Paper text:
The RING-between-RING (RBR) E3 ubiquitin ligase family in humans comprises 14 members and is defined by a two-step catalytic mechanism in which ubiquitin is first transferred from an E2 ubiquitin-conjugating enzyme to the RBR active site and then to the substrate. However, RBRs do not induce the essential closed E2-Ub conformation, but instead stabilise an open E2-Ub conjugate conformation and align the active site cysteine in their RING2 domain with the E2-Ub thioester for Ub transfer from the E2 to the RBR E3 in a transthiolation reaction. In a subsequent step, Ub is transferred from the RBR RING2 active site to the substrate in an aminolysis reaction, analogous to the mechanism of the structurally distinct HECT E3 ligases. We focus on the first catalytic step, i.e., Ub transfer from the E2 to the E3 (transthiolation), and present crystal structures of both RBRs captured in E2-Ub conjugate loaded transthiolation complexes with an additional allosteric Ub.
HOIL-1 shows poor E2-Ub discharge activity in the absence of an allosteric activator or with 5 µM of most di-Ub species, but its activity is strongly enhanced in the presence of M1- or K63-linked di-Ub. In the absence of allosteric Ub, we observe no stable binding of the UbcH7(C86K)-Ub conjugate to the HOIL-1 helix-RBR module. However, the UbcH7(C86K)-Ub conjugate binds tightly when HOIL-1 is preincubated with the allosteric activator M1 di-Ub (KD = 0.2–0.5 µM, n = 2), whereas preincubation with K48 di-Ub, which does not activate HOIL-1 in the E2-Ub discharge assay, enhances E2-Ub binding to a lesser extent (KD = 5.3 µM). We copurified the HOIL-1(C460A)/UbcH7(C86K)-Ub/M1-linked di-Ub complex for crystallisation via size-exclusion chromatography. The HOIL-1 structure contains two near identical complexes (Cα RMSD 0.396 Å) in the crystallographic asymmetric unit. Both complexes consist of the HOIL-1 RBR and the UbcH7-Ub conjugate but show clear electron density for only an additional mono-Ub, rather than the M1-linked di-Ub. Unlike canonical RING domains and all other RBRs, HOIL-1 features an extended loop between the seventh and eight zinc coordinating residues (RING1 Zn2+-loop II) that consists of eight residues in HOIL-1, but only 2-4 residues in all other RBRs and two residues in canonical RING domains. The comparison of the HOIL-1 RING1/E2 sub-complex with the structure of an active RNF4-RING E2-Ub complex shows that the extended loop would prevent formation of the closed E2-Ub conjugate by clashing with Ub in that conformation, therefore blocking Ub discharge from the E2 via the classic RING mechanism and forcing reaction via transthiolation. HOIL-1 I358 is central to the allosteric Ub binding site and, accordingly, the HOIL-1 I358R mutant is less strongly activated by M1-linked di-Ub (EC50 = 24 µM) compared to WT HOIL-1 (2 µM).
Numbering used by the authors:
A (entry chain C): 2 to 153
B (entry chain E): 1 to 76
C (entry chain A): 257 to 510
D (entry chain G): 1 to 75
């Protein structure tokens, strides 16, 4: 069941495109593991891409998949271990109708505008809530230093 | 052979297994009798966490032995 | 004419599964379905297929199977009716769905005693002066004082027999010492409601017990909320109240 | 409307009720069909303990729904 849907999802993903999710490394061996490249649009992340790995469970789509960031980012919702707390794919908010592209665009929207109400780094969340300027500067520096390069 | 599995507070399960049954199979039998998915299960017998891949005979689990179930919950 | 058009909806209340009149796509598996091959939920009028609804009930640990529909804009909050759930599951799968709701309510209550007979599904509620419970499933006299079934012997004898039986049970003492070490070192904790032993794997600083649905604050090692559940700040760690975190190390426990 | 009442023993009863019927009324029907006093009765639907005073419509209990009967022993 999981192989049947995931097969059809990638077919349409490569049919249209996303312009914000490039390098769709999907090995046909293990269909339960995708590798992609998030390209944000708004600052302080407009100067770099981020490698991510999405792991789909065996009970997909009846259970949520989970995304881990390969490229480390100075973000209040993403810890330095790579985890991201996305409400769309939480075990309590997950709905089998949620499509993979919706998850990708929700994560991209979380990156473009962080939300310090459900953070993984409380200090970065407080800094984002209070001093937006210094947080944006530090995030731009981190994206330039440790971030990837945007594919064109 | 029959063994005991203490799960919920006060509930005791009895599983029909064999010494060649792997830990993954035993966790699956618990799911059929409790609905707890194996990824949320970790079994402890005589002070040792049973690792996946191994069998019940590897831990010297004999008949009428009592395993203990603890839940590994994922944070968010 | 409209008196018969509005009359056709009492007709749908007869059968449990309201099937689809016009063909529709199931938004979970992408399978074209003919009239009579798709199922439409009643509390949201969303159309799904045979298996996808069956899989949603299987991989759901909530006592109320929610509708699995979400799109670009909103998230459906409809529920599956038991008549629809029963007519979708086998008698074995349906009985497992009924036992899930009973288990959640039993462990949510702080006055629930289960039968000590292995594999038995019988339990009850107790007060504070009740001393015995004749199980209605296996007809075994559960003793409530020492919390175990001991027939043809008194409590003083059962306590003595349990001591002798445990005096040389090295495997029992080992797993007990492991649990004691796991709680002291903070590797695991007992769920503050149903008292089951739980451990946090990855994530932030909060977990939801899959046995009684109690939200647990991992850092403070206790209930996240009060007796009222999520939102109740009369108890629990009261995190984020007035901006103060519940513990200096806490970063997110809802 | 008709609903089901499952007792842990395995027995399932069918009660003719209405959404306006209170939980006390349902317990009274259970007493009339089983002899179990209402003070020793506890009804459970979808993992929630049904409180007296409220109605079946308050808990979204529709027809052919299955409640569960557990015994409250008095000391
Ligand atoms: Zn489907
Ligand atoms: Zn719906
Ligand atoms: Zn019993
Ligand atoms: Zn006793
Ligand atoms: Zn619990
Ligand atoms: Zn807390
Ligand atoms: Zn907190």
């Amino acid at each position: 069941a999981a192989s049947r849907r995931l097969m059809k999802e990638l077919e349409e993903i490569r049919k249209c495109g996303m312009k914000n999710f490039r390098n769709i490394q999907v090995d046909e061996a293990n269909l339960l593991t995708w590798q992609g490249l998030i390209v944000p649009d708004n600052p302080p992340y407009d100067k770099g891409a981020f490698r991510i790995e999405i792991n789909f469970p065996a009970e997909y789509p009846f259970k949520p998949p989970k995304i881990t960031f390969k490229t480390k980012i100075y973000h209040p919702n993403i810890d330095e271990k790579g985890q991201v707390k996305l409400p769309v794919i939480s075990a309590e908010n997950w709905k089998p109708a949620t499509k993979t592209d919706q998850v990708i665009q929700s994560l991209i929207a979380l990156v473009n505008d962080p939300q310090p109400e459900h953070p993984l780094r409380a200090d970065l969340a407080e800094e984002y809530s209070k001093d937006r300027k210094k947080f944006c500067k530090n995030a731009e520096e981190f994206t330039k230093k440790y971030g990837e390069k945007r594919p064109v | 052979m029959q063994i005991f599995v203490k799960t919920l507070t006060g509930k005791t399960i009895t599983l029909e297994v064999e010494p060649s049954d792997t830990i993954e199979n035993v966790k699956a039998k618990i799911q059929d009798k409790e609905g707890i998915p194996p990824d949320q299960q970790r079994l402890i017998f005589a002070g040792k966490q049973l690792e996946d891949g191994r069998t019940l005979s590897d831990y010297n689990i004999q008949k009428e032995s009592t395993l203990h179930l603890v839940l590994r919950l994922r944070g968010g | 004419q409209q008196e018969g058009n509005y009359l056709q909806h009492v007709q749908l209340d007869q059968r449990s599964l309201v099937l689809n009149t016009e063909p529709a796509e199931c938004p979970v598996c992408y399978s074209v379905l003919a009239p009579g091959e798709a199922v439409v939920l009643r509390e949201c009028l969303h159309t799904f297929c045979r298996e996808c609804l069956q899989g949603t009930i299987r991989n759901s640990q909530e006592a109320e199977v929610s509708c699995p529909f979400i799109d670009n804009t909103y998230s459906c909050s409809g529920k599956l009716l038991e008549r629809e759930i029963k007519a979708l599951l086998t008698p074995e799968d349906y009985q497992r769905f009924l036992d899930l709701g009973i288990s959640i309510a039993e462990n949510r209550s702080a006055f629930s005693y289960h039968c000590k007979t292995p594999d038995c599904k019988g339990w009850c509620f107790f007060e504070d002066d009740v001393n015995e419970f004749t199980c209605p499933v296996c007809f075994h006299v559960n003793c409530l004082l020492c919390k175990a079934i001991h027939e043809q012997m008194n409590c003083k004898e059962y306590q003595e027999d349990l001591a002798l039986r445990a005096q040389n049970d090295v495997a029992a003492r080992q797993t007990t010492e492991m649990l004691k070490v796991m709680l002291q070192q903070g590797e695991a904790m007992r769920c503050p409601q149903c008292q089951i032993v739980v451990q946090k794997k990855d994530g932030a600083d909060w977990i939801r017990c899959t046995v009684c649905h109690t939200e647990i604050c991992w850092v403070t090692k206790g209930p996240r909320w009060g007796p009222g559940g999520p939102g109740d700040t009369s108890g629990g760690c009261r995190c984020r109240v007035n901006g103060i975190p519940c513990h200096p190390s806490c970063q997110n426990c809802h």
